[PDB]
Amino acid sequence: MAKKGYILMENGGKIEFELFPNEAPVTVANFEKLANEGFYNGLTFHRVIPGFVSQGGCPRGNGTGDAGYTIPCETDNNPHRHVTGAMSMAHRGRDTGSCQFFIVHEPQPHLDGVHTVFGQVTSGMDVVRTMKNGDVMKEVKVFDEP
């Protein structure tokens, strides 16, 4: 069994990604639940870094949305390196996770294991490189695809 989804951007862009329950069952599940509730509709990337790793999940730049989901720092079962396309959930340790997440354009060895990787962009990564600071997410959806 496996999962995937897409981030449709308000500016007409689109970032298609796949999720790995094996990397983080809880993180993937929670992200899916939020996405399919339209949670990320209107949430922006408040820290975009063209060419590298961008961070988003801020409701119109209001910081932290009321996701109702908090996760620990996970390392099992698969390695959580921030390689090309990698997507991780932002946290600082146990019971610190939220709804904010990263998208990696350029691999960052120094971020490897720092956050909990739960997904990975497979197509449309170019959107990240050309992403603007505070770019709005229009439609984030997740569905099953073994």
DSSP string, 130-143: T--TTPBEEEEEEE
DSSP designation for 47: B
- 57 closest CA partner among 122, 143, 136: 136
Tell me the CB-side half-sphere exposure of residue 103, using CA atoms within 13 A.
30
- How many domains is the chain partitioned into structurally? 1
The domain that holds 94 is classified in CATH as 2.40.100.10
* 56 close to 35: Cβ distance less than 8 angstroms: no
| CB proximity list for 49: less than 8 A, separation 6 or greater | none
Q: How was this structure determined?
A: NMR
* CA angle 126–47–41, rounded 5-degree value: 75
**Closest by Cα among 3, 1, 69 to 39:** 69
Q: Can you tell me the distance from the alpha carbon of 110 to that of 52, in angstroms, rounded to the nearest whole number?
A: 12
**Summary count for the chain: helices (H), strands (E):** 2, 9
Report the half-sphere exposure of 92 (CA within 13 A, side-chain side).
1
CA distance 62 to 14: 23
φ/ψ (deg, to 5) at 118: -135, -15
CA distance 110 to 47: 18
What domain range includes position 90? 1-146
